[PDB]
Amino acid sequence: TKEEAQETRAQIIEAAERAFYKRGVARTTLADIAELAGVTRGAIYWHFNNKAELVQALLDSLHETHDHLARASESEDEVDPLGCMRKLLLQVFNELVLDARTRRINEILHHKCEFTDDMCEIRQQRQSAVLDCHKGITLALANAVRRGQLPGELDAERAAVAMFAYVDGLIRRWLLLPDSVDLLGDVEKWVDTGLDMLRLSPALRK
């Protein structure tokens, strides 16, 4: 409930993003995240025990902007879940293009963050999160089955992986070669292309 410590936590997060982004997550110490932030070594430790905790705080911020539509899509009480899933994807893509903060954490996540046995928790955290995310899209896809928006004999599980794979590879393609996906201009196409596969692909049924 104090405020200096809420200010200081929010500045460690900013510095970390800028640091991890220049030097990468591998060779960046917490001492480093200190000098850049203006703060003190001790303060980073009060706030974060280790760098894997910090990285986790970063990955976690990405789910905040989307919580609403995510929760709506998966509630069995939603009238239009495919509807919420389509708007979620439009928002994910839009936020990625407009918001430099999101583009950078994604860049840290995809191109600047090694899984080395020396730092085992980076990978575990990441596994957990993809399983989480996985959980969600499944409940959601199965809801669009009941309500007759997706084919009735769909395999939610596999369909979820298909879609996740598709969204993940596309975000990554765009971070590597933005000038090859007019992702802002065509966002509707890219999102719908993914959904297409889910509703029509015969190999996703059963």
Ligand X SMILES: CN(C)[C@@H]1C(O)=C(C(N)=O)C(=O)[C@@]2(O)C(O)=C3C(=O)c4c(O)cccc4[C@@](C)(O)[C@H]3C[C@@H]12
For its own copies, the binding residues in 42-101 under the rule CB under 8 A are none
- Nearer residue to its own copies within complex by CB, 81 or 194: 194
In sequence order, the 6+-apart residues with CB closer than 8 A to the CB of 185 are none
- Nearer residue to its own copies within complex by CB, 13 or 163: 163
- Nearer residue to ligand X within complex by CB, 7 or 182: 182
By CB under 8 A, name the one of 42, 148, 152, 202 that touches its own copies: 202
Residue 152, Ramachandran bin (φ over 0: left; ψ between -120 and 50: alpha; else beta): alpha
Interaction site with ligand X (CB under 6 A): 59, 62, 66, 70, 85, 88, 92, 96, 102, 106, 109, 133, 137, 163-164, 167-168, 171
Torsion angle in degrees (nearest 10) through CA of 158, 162, 167, 169:
130
Binding partner of residue 150 among its own copies, ligand X, none, CB cut-off 5 to 8 Å per kind: none
Torsion angle in degrees (nearest 10) through CA of 153, 139, 195, 183:
-170
By CB under 8 A, name the one of 15, 89, 113, 141 that touches its own copies: 113
What are the beta bridge partners of residue 186? none
Spatial distance between the Cα atoms of 67 and 24, rounded to a whole number of angstroms:
28
Q: Does 131 bind its own copies (CB under 8 A)?
A: yes
Binding partner of residue 49 among its own copies, ligand X, none, CB cut-off 5 to 8 Å per kind: none
Q: Does 136 bind its own copies (CB under 8 A)?
A: no
The string of DSSP letters for 31-46 reads HHHHHHHSS-HHHHHH
